[PDB]
Amino acid sequence: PSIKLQSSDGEIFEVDVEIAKQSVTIKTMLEDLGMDPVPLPNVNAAILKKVIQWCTHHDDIPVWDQEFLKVDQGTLFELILAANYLDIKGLLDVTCKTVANMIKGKTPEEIRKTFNIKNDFTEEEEAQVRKENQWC
């Protein structure tokens, strides 16, 4: 079979059921509320199209997901939200994990260069924070 879902943009997508049911949100609306098509206000055609891609293709992070998520920040940010909104445990985990790996590895000074972030700590406050979270 095959159901249709409408992105927030107004673009209709035709996806094989089951590939679509990897989203309990879409699943709930299909099986329980009987939505035809399925309106997805929080997901636009661009991300929805990306989510559908990851789903048709279906702890540690595979080599495909690693490449597929080799995207830019914001897109990753969008995938985390679409995954949360759509309720796709797999996608959510893989994307969130990918963000964590950007932090692993240390220095607070380096963590900023990666996420921008500004040191809004006052002279004293920074000292206090450095002491409290002292390692070794």
Partner: protein
Amino acid sequence: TQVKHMMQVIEPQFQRDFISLLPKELALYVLSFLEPKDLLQAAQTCRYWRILAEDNLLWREKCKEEGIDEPLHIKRVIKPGFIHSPWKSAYIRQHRIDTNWRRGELKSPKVLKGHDDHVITCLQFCGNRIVSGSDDNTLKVWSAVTGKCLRTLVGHTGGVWSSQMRDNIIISGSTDRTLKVWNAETGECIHTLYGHTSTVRCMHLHEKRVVSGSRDATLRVWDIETGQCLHVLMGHVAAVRCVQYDGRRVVSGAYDFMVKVWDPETETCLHTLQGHTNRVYSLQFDGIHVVSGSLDTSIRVWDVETGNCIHTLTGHQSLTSGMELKDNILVSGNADSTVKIWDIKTGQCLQTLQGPNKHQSAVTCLQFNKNFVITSSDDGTVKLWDLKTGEFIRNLVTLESGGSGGVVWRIRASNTKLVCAVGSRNGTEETKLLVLDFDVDM
């Protein structure tokens, strides 16, 4: 909540970063993929991050990882308040304690002089109470906290060679052939147990019952409350040197090269484990596996249900004095001056503690946990080792008289402290207990 409170009251505002813009929950789902070491660096990024990383349920689980189970509640006031997570501080506390054992400056230990010119034959460390036993015929209850002697259990007419303790109840075994039950607080003998004819060499307490092994070749099970002798286990032809009791089975090791498994209630020997070609000196039992160390140099691992030998662990070259079994990981101290770590499931010898900083003589005692192995020796040192790598870390104690008589007879360790029974046969070291503290200021 709590994380929201912080945001409203502190008002960080305006962050151009990926996680500060994510809904609180998803930022947390992300930070949860990090390890404590990361979360601590992340928390030094900015106030927004610090507030996030300081969750609580995030740390409650990171603690359930290092097996913490109990959060730490500190007390007291700076301005811009911060709602510290008890679980997080509990984690850091432990981290600091581990580091303290590992490389923290060695604070001179409390010295507890006692048992002059005699040997401390048995040691017990429970909570804030230390109990030393001696062939000087007495036992002394001490405060690990103040280092003061609280009481001296005088009563035996022979030397004390064994003991057991379970908060306020102390038990002793003497050459005078009797066990005695004491009140650790008042220091009064509550019972005197007769029945053994020869030296009460070993004993193991489980709840309200205690089992004793003697040179008379028998064991007896006693009720600590009613000072009575419930059962007598007869079947060993030679002296009983070691014993274990889990409340269900009694396991014994004797100088007849035999290990016997018993059902006390019916005074029957269910199994006689045969294999050791010499005296059995040490035993450990976890309700499933019996483990015995012999003067024959080997260590056997047996199935308590079938009586079958599962592994014959070889490698030591002399008498295995003590062994400790936890979670199927076994650590054996040997007169060959070596210490070994084994996986009693596979039989693999995970590590041998030796190297340039190994013991120069027989290992007399040992303690271990998930991170370290603590070993004592006639060489007058107590060493700290890395359990996961088998590497030497440092000498926690180094008796100056070590090479000329100074000896460390036995040790007991808690999470924050180490108690060492020390002395000598020649007077170069006065007998005493050394108490080292590794607690942290929090």
